Short mmCIF file of C-alpha atoms (C1' of nucleotides) in Angstrom, two decimals:
data_model
loop_
_atom_site.label_atom_id
_atom_site.label_comp_id
_atom_site.label_asym_id
_atom_site.label_seq_id
_atom_site.Cartn_x
_atom_site.Cartn_y
_atom_site.Cartn_z
CA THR A 87 260.12 104.88 58.22
CA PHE A 88 262.30 106.72 55.67
CA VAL A 89 260.43 109.15 53.39
CA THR A 90 262.56 110.78 50.75
CA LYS A 91 262.19 112.63 47.44
CA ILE A 92 264.12 111.39 44.40
CA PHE A 93 264.58 113.02 41.00
CA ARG A 94 263.73 110.29 38.53
CA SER A 95 266.75 109.51 36.36
CA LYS A 96 268.95 106.57 35.20
CA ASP A 97 270.12 106.11 38.85
CA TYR A 98 266.63 105.77 40.33
CA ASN A 99 266.42 101.96 40.47
CA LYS A 100 269.63 101.56 42.46
CA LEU A 101 268.25 103.71 45.29
CA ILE A 102 265.04 101.61 45.26
CA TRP A 103 267.16 98.39 45.43
CA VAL A 104 269.17 99.73 48.39
CA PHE A 105 265.97 100.79 50.17
CA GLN A 106 264.54 97.31 49.63
CA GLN A 107 267.74 95.96 51.09
CA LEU A 108 267.33 98.06 54.21
CA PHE A 109 263.50 98.13 54.50
CA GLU A 110 260.76 95.55 54.52
CA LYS A 111 258.43 97.46 52.16
CA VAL A 112 259.54 100.23 49.77
CA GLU A 113 257.03 102.07 47.62
CA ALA A 114 257.04 105.28 45.62
CA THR A 115 254.22 107.71 44.78
CA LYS A 116 253.49 111.21 43.51
CA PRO A 117 251.11 113.24 45.72
CA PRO A 118 248.75 115.62 43.90
CA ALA A 119 250.43 118.57 45.66
CA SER A 120 253.55 117.93 43.60
CA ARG A 121 253.10 119.33 40.10
CA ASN A 122 252.85 116.77 37.33
CA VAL A 123 255.48 118.46 35.22
CA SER A 124 258.07 117.95 37.98
CA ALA A 125 260.15 114.76 37.89
CA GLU A 126 260.27 114.48 41.67
CA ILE A 127 258.85 111.25 43.18
CA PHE A 128 258.27 110.65 46.93
CA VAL A 129 259.32 107.13 47.99
CA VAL A 130 258.60 105.79 51.52
"C1'" U B 288 223.43 -18.33 -28.39
"C1'" G B 289 219.13 -15.79 -31.28
"C1'" A B 290 217.82 -11.48 -35.17
"C1'" G B 291 218.78 -8.05 -39.29
"C1'" G B 292 222.52 -6.66 -43.58
"C1'" G B 293 226.90 -8.03 -47.16
"C1'" C B 294 229.74 -11.48 -50.41
"C1'" C B 295 228.32 -17.28 -52.20
"C1'" U B 296 225.80 -21.04 -54.19
"C1'" U B 297 221.94 -24.88 -55.39
"C1'" G B 298 217.01 -26.30 -58.20
"C1'" G B 299 212.18 -24.91 -60.38
"C1'" U B 300 210.32 -20.97 -62.97
"C1'" C B 301 209.13 -16.67 -66.47
"C1'" A B 302 212.56 -13.16 -72.35
"C1'" C B 303 222.27 -10.38 -68.57
"C1'" G B 304 216.98 -9.48 -65.46
"C1'" G B 305 212.49 -10.87 -62.27
"C1'" C B 306 209.50 -14.72 -59.14
"C1'" C B 307 209.50 -19.26 -55.22
"C1'" U B 308 212.99 -22.21 -52.23
"C1'" U B 309 217.73 -24.68 -50.30
"C1'" G B 310 222.90 -24.63 -46.64
"C1'" G B 311 228.18 -20.11 -44.14
"C1'" C B 312 228.82 -4.70 -40.07
"C1'" U B 313 224.43 -3.16 -36.64
"C1'" U B 314 221.62 -5.27 -32.71
"C1'" G B 315 218.90 -8.50 -28.85
"C1'" C B 316 219.12 -12.09 -24.58
"C1'" U B 317 222.45 -14.74 -21.05
"C1'" A B 318 227.84 -16.13 -18.41
"C1'" C B 319 233.01 -14.06 -15.81
"C1'" A B 320 235.70 -9.39 -14.95
"C1'" A B 321 235.26 -3.06 -14.21
"C1'" U B 322 232.77 -0.04 -11.00
"C1'" U B 323 238.71 6.04 -8.39
"C1'" A B 324 233.91 7.12 -15.81
"C1'" A B 325 237.52 10.72 -9.46
"C1'" C B 326 238.40 9.23 -17.15
"C1'" G B 327 237.83 10.70 -22.15
"C1'" A B 328 235.51 12.84 -26.50
"C1'" U B 329 232.48 16.45 -28.94
"C1'" C B 330 229.35 20.76 -29.75
"C1'" A B 331 228.88 25.54 -28.01
"C1'" A B 332 230.62 30.43 -25.27
"C1'" C B 333 235.37 34.07 -24.00
"C1'" U B 334 238.61 38.60 -24.33
"C1'" U B 335 243.63 43.30 -20.87
"C1'" A B 336 238.85 48.57 -15.80
"C1'" G B 337 241.56 51.46 -15.46
"C1'" A B 338 241.60 57.11 -15.24
"C1'" A B 339 243.78 61.93 -13.25
"C1'" C B 340 249.02 64.44 -12.11
"C1'" U B 341 245.87 67.98 -7.03
"C1'" G B 342 247.89 69.77 -3.20
"C1'" G B 343 248.57 70.74 1.89
"C1'" U B 344 252.52 68.67 5.47
"C1'" A B 345 256.47 68.59 9.08
"C1'" C B 346 261.57 70.52 8.21
"C1'" G B 347 265.98 73.73 6.66
"C1'" G B 348 266.57 79.78 5.34
"C1'" A B 349 264.66 85.88 4.63
"C1'" C B 350 259.64 89.20 4.54
"C1'" A B 351 255.55 89.79 6.91
"C1'" A B 352 250.75 95.96 8.64
"C1'" G B 353 255.07 98.72 12.83
"C1'" G B 354 259.85 103.32 17.19
"C1'" G B 355 260.34 100.76 21.89
"C1'" G B 356 260.89 100.35 27.85
"C1'" A B 357 259.80 101.29 33.18
"C1'" A B 358 257.24 103.49 37.07
"C1'" U B 359 253.47 106.64 39.34
"C1'" C B 360 248.36 109.44 39.34
"C1'" U B 361 243.73 107.98 37.83
"C1'" G B 362 238.53 104.71 35.94
"C1'" A B 363 235.53 100.11 36.31
"C1'" C B 364 237.68 96.18 39.88
"C1'" U B 365 240.50 89.03 40.76
"C1'" G B 366 242.82 85.23 43.18
"C1'" U B 367 251.56 89.70 43.31
"C1'" U B 368 255.94 95.20 41.69
"C1'" A B 369 248.09 91.08 40.42
"C1'" A B 370 246.02 92.08 35.85
"C1'" C B 371 242.88 95.64 32.53
"C1'" G B 372 242.38 100.91 29.87
"C1'" A B 373 245.18 102.24 22.30
"C1'" G B 374 243.10 107.62 30.20
#
RNA sequence: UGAGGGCCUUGGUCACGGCCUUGGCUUGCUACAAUUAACGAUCAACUUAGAACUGGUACGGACAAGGGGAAUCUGACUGUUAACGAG
């Protein structure tokens, strides 16, 4: 399982597509520990 | 073939006109046709109902209330990155 943090931007969907290519299920989330103001998103 | 009318006429009768008698168009009864009168004639009845000029239709061409898009956290919670909330 690959768990990474991505800064949301215009190049965020391409990473998701590549992960879907290499992984059977790809899903992103934002844990409450990460501050809401931050643009980071944790995708597994 | 019988009746009634019209024009004739013959004698007697009463002062051209009456009275009494003499012989030659309508209808009645019989005989043969017609019965597609399924025709014709006449008297009486009869006048032209139409108004109004409303819209929705499918089509062809511009407006229509108004800054949009995606994903996560979250709240009540089905059969696909489900959906829903003017969070």
